[PDB]
Amino acid sequence: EVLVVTSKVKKLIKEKGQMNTSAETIDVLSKAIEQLCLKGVESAKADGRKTVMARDIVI
Amino acid sequence: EVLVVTSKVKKLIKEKGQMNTSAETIDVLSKAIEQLCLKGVESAKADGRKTVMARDIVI
DNA sequence: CGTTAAAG
DNA sequence: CGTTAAAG
């Protein structure tokens, strides 16, 4: 379910912008990781590989 | 440094694609979270808010 | 040691 | 910020 380290995302946002982070922001970041991983699976399989690589995460 | 839950990203990729996940893939996912959070800070500040919200993470 | 509760 | 879970 939760694919981001909430404490570290909040520490980064507080330190860089002096701002809080909503529960829903954490949810969007987790869903974003999920979709990157699933599209990374498609890309590695399309190339016949058994490993998702950095080049499979299109950003 | 590491903003993704590595064990859960690897579990997701293994379960969904029967594939391994490279060290460099985890690094790209962490860098992707970092850039989303920093762009989220810019968006919330531009709107004069003290909270990064779901609508500040443009995907 | 990051997450979840709830003491101060 | 101490307690409760569970990632590393």
UniProtKB/TrEMBL annotation, chains A, B:
InterPro entries reported in the protein's UniProt record: CBFA_NFYB_domain, Histone-fold
SUPFAM superfamilies: Histone-fold (SSF47113)
One MF term in the entry's GO annotations: protein heterodimerization activity
Entry superkingdom: Bacteria
Transmembrane region(s): none
Domain Transcription factor CBF/NF-Y/archaeal histone: 8-57
Protein name (database record): Transcription factor CBF/NF-Y/archaeal histone domain-containing protein
Pfam families hit by this protein: CBFD_NFYB_HMF
